[model samples]
Target: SVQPNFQQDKFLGRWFSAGLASNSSWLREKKAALSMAKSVVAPATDGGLNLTSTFLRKNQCETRTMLLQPAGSLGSYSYRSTYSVSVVETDYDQYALLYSQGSKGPGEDFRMATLYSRTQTPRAELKEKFTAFCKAQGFTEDTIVFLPQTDKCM
Candidate 1:
């Protein structure tokens, strides 16, 4: 479920990637090399949002920006007409749980859950909650990963 009465302003700021759970093949292949990433959320024109994420990949810093268009409700967004994103839960301070699903074609879809923390280190309880949430969403243990800390991308 998405957060109730989601406040866009309060949710804006820097967030560190703590964990991720997904059934996508790309994640399965790249998880071993993946490390913690960080993102900055900023308000965009037309009541949308812009999220810029930076991470270390292959010993190089890679940055990407995603423009999330406001969907039917608050805290819900859409990307490129194929992916839908929502803030599953958040406290606006410590942690935020985000869910996203993308459709490539008929009967071809992938879902992912992302755990973001206010700091570089994630709280134990929040990590557990993220696991439980991912399991509830049909992701298995092998698909869930706690991203390792990385100092290069920050």
Candidate 2:
């Protein structure tokens, strides 16, 4: 078994989406029917994980960007983004939170985030932490969609 790389400085590069690990209910009847998936990731930062692309279905693709804060943690960004880490294996073991509100940046799309990871799935403790973090930030439990990306090429 290999230990995970938890350092943002060690995570970077160009990678593509392989598969989706999300609950069917997260998507609406229309989007899900359209084969839409949420391949979310932390955008490339001066020192954070990066996700460039993911396995999209049909016209579907990931919508992400990085909010480089003058001061923020590698695991946490100043704001949420749709970026992914392409510098390593499909599963970077990283996770992101999707706010109910779209980014305050120059974008006009009503989309929530889809949490992703470098592995197939995360441990219970991690999910719990995520849930707690969201709740603390005023997000309902049902609003967050915990997901793991498929490592396969699809």
Candidate 3:
């Protein structure tokens, strides 16, 4: 997979997660619904991206932050990060595609594919592009869920 060469500083800011493609039981259980998913990304040293992900699920809010250090590159459009994750695609301004799989100790598994955009509501073309991108990554359309955007932010 050719990954996008992201300019660490240029990619820093608040982003809205317009869609998500994954079959992770955790996400399903959280009911990560509309009016959720606001992320703040900041540039760290060594082309790293420090992510503060906040999601509203089932009327409750949760936040998680992590620093994704660059692991290696698969191609110009793919680069592995911490927690066995990688960036599949990104344009620096519009949308981003991510793939990650994490193992806890030995048994717990955390895997997911995420889509992000500059605005809360992305254009139709952007959404289509994201869906296509996910399919290429071996995810089914049924597993892809388009996230909702709202004025509520915390």
Candidate 4:
């Protein structure tokens, strides 16, 4: 949901997952952290870049290690997600709401989101752009929701 932090690659690192009504506790679980790394690769000649990632999770969790490339346009992909970053005065939070993008699915379809700000929260500009990004991707504010954040949001 955040714009690529072209200035500080440090933003790429361990992020704690949260928001799932079924797995709020999972954020504290050792397995809830997502190891994110910033690397460079070429975008497919066709258009989008191939995102190779390893999604680590618990027992039933099958780490998704694969190439994530947009199939074609929005319609080509089985589903799309729009992410938003909440912004306040000058700070934006590290969290985001990724909802069915370019379209929506059944009411029950959604995923948990999280981040690791061992020190601080995100800045305001970040939140604005992310919000716009979500809107551009076909998400209405009404269709989006944020997971309960750690008491830190206040």
Best by TM-score: 1
**Per-residue CA lDDT of candidate 2, range 1-154, in tens?**
0113435443343332222222224343323433323343353435443343443355544444444432242344333433221221213435433333234553323333333433445567556655665466555566554433433433
How does candidate 4 score on lDDT? 0.32
**Root-mean-square deviation (CA) per prediction:** 1.8, 8.4, 3.9, 10.1
Over the stretch 37-129, how does candidate 4's per-residue lDDT look in tens digits?
A: 222223444433332333323322233322224443321212224321221111222543323222343422333222222223344544455
How close to the true structure is residue 51 of candidate 3, measured as C-alpha lDDT?
82
Tell me the tens digit of each residue's lDDT in model 1 across 76-152. Answer: 99887278889999999999999998844531377889999998888799999899999999999998888776878
Model 2, stretches more than 4 Å misplaced?
Answer: 1-8, 13-50, 56-116
TM-score for each predicted model, relative to the true structure? 0.91, 0.42, 0.76, 0.29
Model 1: per-residue Cα lDDT at residue 141:
95
lDDT of 3 by residue, 48-119 (tens): 667887876556777777777765653112223225666677887888777776534332355567778888
RMSD of 3: 3.9
- lDDT, model 2: 0.39
lDDT agreement with native, every candidate: 0.86, 0.39, 0.69, 0.32
RMSD to the native, candidate 4? 10.1
